[PDB]
Design a protein around this ligand. Sequence first.
Ligand code: IZV
Ligand code: IZV
Ligand code: IZV
Ligand code: IZV
Ligand code: IZV
Ligand code: IZV
Ligand code: IZV
Ligand code: IZV
Ligand code: IZV
Ligand code: IZV
Ligand code: IZV
Ligand code: IZV
Lengths: 55, 55, 55, 55, 55, 55, 55, 55, 55, 55
Amino acid sequence: KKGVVHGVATVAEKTKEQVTNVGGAVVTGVTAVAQKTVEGAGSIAAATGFVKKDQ
Amino acid sequence: KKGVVHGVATVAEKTKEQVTNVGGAVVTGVTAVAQKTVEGAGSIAAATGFVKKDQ
Amino acid sequence: KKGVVHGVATVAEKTKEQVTNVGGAVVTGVTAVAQKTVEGAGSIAAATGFVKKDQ
Amino acid sequence: KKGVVHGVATVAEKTKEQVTNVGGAVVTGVTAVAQKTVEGAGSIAAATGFVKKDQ
Amino acid sequence: KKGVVHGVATVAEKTKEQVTNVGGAVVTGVTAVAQKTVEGAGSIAAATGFVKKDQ
Amino acid sequence: KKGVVHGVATVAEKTKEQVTNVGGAVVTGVTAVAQKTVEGAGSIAAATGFVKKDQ
Amino acid sequence: KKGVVHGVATVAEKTKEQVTNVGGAVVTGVTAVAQKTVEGAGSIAAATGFVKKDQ
Amino acid sequence: KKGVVHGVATVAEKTKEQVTNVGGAVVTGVTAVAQKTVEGAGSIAAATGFVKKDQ
Amino acid sequence: KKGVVHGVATVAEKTKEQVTNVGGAVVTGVTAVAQKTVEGAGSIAAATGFVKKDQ
Amino acid sequence: KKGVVHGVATVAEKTKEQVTNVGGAVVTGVTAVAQKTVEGAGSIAAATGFVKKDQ
Ligand SMILES: CNc1ccc(-c2nc3ccc(O)cc3s2)cc1
Ligand SMILES: CNc1ccc(-c2nc3ccc(O)cc3s2)cc1
Ligand SMILES: CNc1ccc(-c2nc3ccc(O)cc3s2)cc1
Ligand SMILES: CNc1ccc(-c2nc3ccc(O)cc3s2)cc1
Ligand SMILES: CNc1ccc(-c2nc3ccc(O)cc3s2)cc1
Ligand SMILES: CNc1ccc(-c2nc3ccc(O)cc3s2)cc1
Ligand SMILES: CNc1ccc(-c2nc3ccc(O)cc3s2)cc1
Ligand SMILES: CNc1ccc(-c2nc3ccc(O)cc3s2)cc1
Ligand SMILES: CNc1ccc(-c2nc3ccc(O)cc3s2)cc1
Ligand SMILES: CNc1ccc(-c2nc3ccc(O)cc3s2)cc1
Ligand SMILES: CNc1ccc(-c2nc3ccc(O)cc3s2)cc1
Ligand SMILES: CNc1ccc(-c2nc3ccc(O)cc3s2)cc1
């Protein structure tokens, strides 16, 4: 076989899960957050996949 | 087989799940948030997939 | 087989779920949010798939 | 088989769900939000798939 | 076989999970956060995959 | 002060919430159930406060 | 002060929450269930407060 | 002070939370269940407070 | 002071939390369950407070 | 002071937490279970407080 990509690719066979991202956010997984009190200014309480590039 | 992509591709066979994103947000997964009190200015309480690029 | 894409594609066979996004938001998954009080100015309380690019 | 796309495509066979988006928003999944009080100016309380690009 | 990529690629066969990211965040895994009180200004309470590049 | 009860009482001062039950069911709290498929004969899918005394 | 009870009482002062139960079920708390598939005969999927006394 | 109870009592002062139960179930706490697939006959998947006295 | 109980009592002062139970189940605490697949016949997957007295 | 109990009592002063149980189950503490696959017939996967007296 032959393949040429510029990116971003994701090429496969017999594949149970696939995610391609440029951005941006993708949530595909099981996630449970239980929480009782959030205070403070300002605290990232429960972050799973996170990116902060403030300018 | 032969394939040429510019991106972003996601090419496969026999594949249970697929996500392609440029952006942007995609939520495809099970997610449960239970929460009782959020305060503060300003706190990211429960973030799963998150991207902040303020300018 | 042969395939040429510019992107964004999502090409497959025998595939249970598919999402293609450029944007933008796509919500296809099970999601439960239970919440009792949100305060503060301004706090992202419960974000699952999120993108903030304010200019 | 043969396929050439400009994007955004989503090509498949035997496929239970499909979403193609350029935009924009698509909601196809089960979603339950229960909520008791939202205050503050201005707090994104419960966001599932979200994109904010204010200029 | 032959392959030439510019990156970022992810090329495979017989592959159970795949993630390609440029960004950005991708959450595909099981995650449980249980939490009782978050205070302080400002403390990253529970971060799993995290990136902070404030300027 | 003086108090004599037979039960069931609930006596208080300065009290934000109160529930008295003999029975029976009382639901006063925030509750979110999101659900996609229930099968089987017969499975209690999502029970929060539950009592089964079949004879 | 003086108090005589037969039960079940709940006597207090300056008290934020109170529950008295004989039964029976009382749900006063925040609860989020997100769920995607329930099968089997018969499986208690997600039980929070539960009592089964079948005869 | 003086107190005589038969039970079940719960007597206090300056008390943030109170639960009295004879039964029966009481759910007053924050709870998040996220779940993707339940099978089998019959499996208690996610039980928090649970009592099974089948006869 | 003087106190005579038959049980079950719970007598206190200046007390943040109280639970009295005869039964039965009481859930007052923060709880997060995230789960992806449950199979088998029949397996207690995730049990927090649990009592099984089948006859 | 003077006290006579039959049991089960729990008598105190200046006390942050209290639990009295006859039964039965009480869950008052923070608990996080994250889990990916449960199989087998039948295996107690993750048990925190547990009692099995099958007859
Ligand atoms: C995040 N902001 C952003 C803006 C623009 C893009 C673009 N991606 C492509 C790809 C192929 C093409 O012919 C044109 C474009 S423009 C991506 C991201
Ligand atoms: C010292 N370590 C540190 C980590 C994180 C922070 C953050 N500050 C903000 C403010 C607004 C917002 O939406 C998100 C965040 S995160 C600050 C400090
Ligand atoms: C070893 N390096 C490598 C890079 C890329 C490939 C590719 N194979 C295909 C097939 C179909 C298609 O539309 C695109 C592509 S790209 C293969 C191998
Ligand atoms: C952390 N900041 C950062 C900025 C830029 C990069 C880049 N990586 C590549 C790779 C290939 C290419 O043709 C161009 C670039 S630019 C990486 C990181
Ligand atoms: C984090 N900031 C960032 C900005 C830009 C990039 C880019 N990655 C590629 C890859 C191929 C290409 O032809 C162009 C570009 S630009 C990556 C990261
Ligand atoms: C994070 N900010 C960002 C801006 C731009 C990009 C771009 N990626 C590509 C890829 C191919 C192409 O022909 C054009 C572009 S532009 C990526 C990231
Ligand atoms: C030391 N053991 C003890 C047991 C029980 C008590 C009680 N005090 C009160 C007051 C008012 C009321 O309606 C009921 C009761 S019960 C006090 C002490
Ligand atoms: C679980 N089944 C059940 C049946 C009956 C009861 C009763 N509790 C009281 C209390 C005082 C009284 O004068 C009478 C009765 S009867 C409780 C439970
Ligand atoms: C060996 N360990 C074991 C634990 C638990 C069980 C249970 N069997 C049932 C049947 C019906 C129902 O509503 C709940 C349950 S739980 C069986 C065995
Ligand atoms: C486990 N099975 C079980 C059955 C019965 C009990 C009882 N505990 C008390 C206490 C005082 C009283 O006057 C009566 C009774 S009965 C306890 C356990
Ligand atoms: C679990 N099954 C059950 C049946 C009956 C009870 C009873 N509790 C009391 C208390 C005072 C009283 O005068 C009568 C009764 S009966 C409790 C439990
Ligand atoms: C688990 N099964 C069960 C049955 C009965 C009980 C009883 N507890 C009391 C307490 C005081 C009283 O005057 C009567 C009774 S009966 C408890 C448990």
